[PDB]
């Protein structure tokens, strides 16, 4: 059971929020590419 969130202490000025569908021996291989091009 997930009952511990300790990643931040505050959130002051939000510009953008987006809630989406979930993306997700070792059995799974997850490849991701993150790019910042022209904003």
């Amino acid at each position: 059971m997930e009952s511990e969130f300790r990643v931040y202490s505050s959130a002051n000025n939000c510009t953008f929020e987006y809630v989406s569908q979930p993306f997700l021996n070792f059995k799974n291989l997850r490849e991701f590419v993150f790019k910042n091009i022209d904003g």
Binding site: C14, T15, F16, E17
Partner: protein, 50 residues
């Protein structure tokens, strides 16, 4: 809200249909400064402060 404590709603990441507001008969003042109502339905903006 009261004018001293005016509510501010930030509007982002959606489709803004301004013709529903402009063609309503329920508004007495619809004075736009810096832009015309006819091209509001064409232009695109980063954020809307209400």
């Amino acid at each position: 809200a009261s004018v001293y404590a005016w509510n501010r709603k930030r509007i982002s990441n959606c489709v803004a249909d301004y013709s529903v507001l402009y063609n309503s008969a329920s508004f007495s003042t619809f004075k736009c400064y810096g832009v015309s109502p006819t091209k509001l339905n064409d232009l695109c903006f980063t954020n809307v402060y209400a």
